[PDB]
């Protein structure tokens, strides 16, 4: 429980309740390699919410790609998680989601956005701890970031997510 409690504190420390989340991934080179080697294919981010008692969500990233992006792109997905107040929320989840890889020189951020596929299993009320992740398989070419550029600085990158609150 001592370590279990530390995990709760860490999660609380990262949570946000306004639909905006900035995910800092440090030790980039090491994690990048664990992905290339297949030892650790993906990483889940801490959870964040649309409001104090809104939808619970997180992100999932494949530093060496998933599906159509395997081995060639950084794949980034959105995840709807089972939240404590799901019974009070409207389903399926239907908020626009914006995903970004921040340029640490504020020159040119990588950005993409999508509206949920209402008929998809990914956006129905969660029965399990998490629904299947959905998003961008070809979010960013491995050469784009990683290599040089200004996305990786001091061995860390920043991923940003913005969940539109229209209707909430």
């Amino acid at each position: 429980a001592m370590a279990d409690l530390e995990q709760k504190v860490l999660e609380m420390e990262a949570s946000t309740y306004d639909g905006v989340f900035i995910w800092k991934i440090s030790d980039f080179p090491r994690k990048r390699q664990e992905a290339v080697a297949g030892r650790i294919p993906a990483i889940f981010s801490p959870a964040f919410y649309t409001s104090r008692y809104g939808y619970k969500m997180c992100l999932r990233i494949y530093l060496n790609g998933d599906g159509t992006g395997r081995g060639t792109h950084l794949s980034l997905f959105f995840v709807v998680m089972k939240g404590p107040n799901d019974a009070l929320l409207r389903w399926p989840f239907n908020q626009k989601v914006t995903l970004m890889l921040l340029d640490q020189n504020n020159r040119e951020h990588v950005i993409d956005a999508f509206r949920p596929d209402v008929t998809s299993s990914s956006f129905q009320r969660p029965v399990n701890d998490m629904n299947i992740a959905s998003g961008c398989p070809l979010f960013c070419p491995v050469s784009k970031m990683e290599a040089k550029n200004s996305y990786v600085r001091d061995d860390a990158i920043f991923i940003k997510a913005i969940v539109d609150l229209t209707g909430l």
Binding site: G67, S75, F77, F78, F114, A133, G135, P137
Partner: peptide, 5 residues
């Protein structure tokens, strides 16, 4: 959106 594989 496209689901992860």
């Amino acid at each position: 959106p496209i689901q992860e594989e």
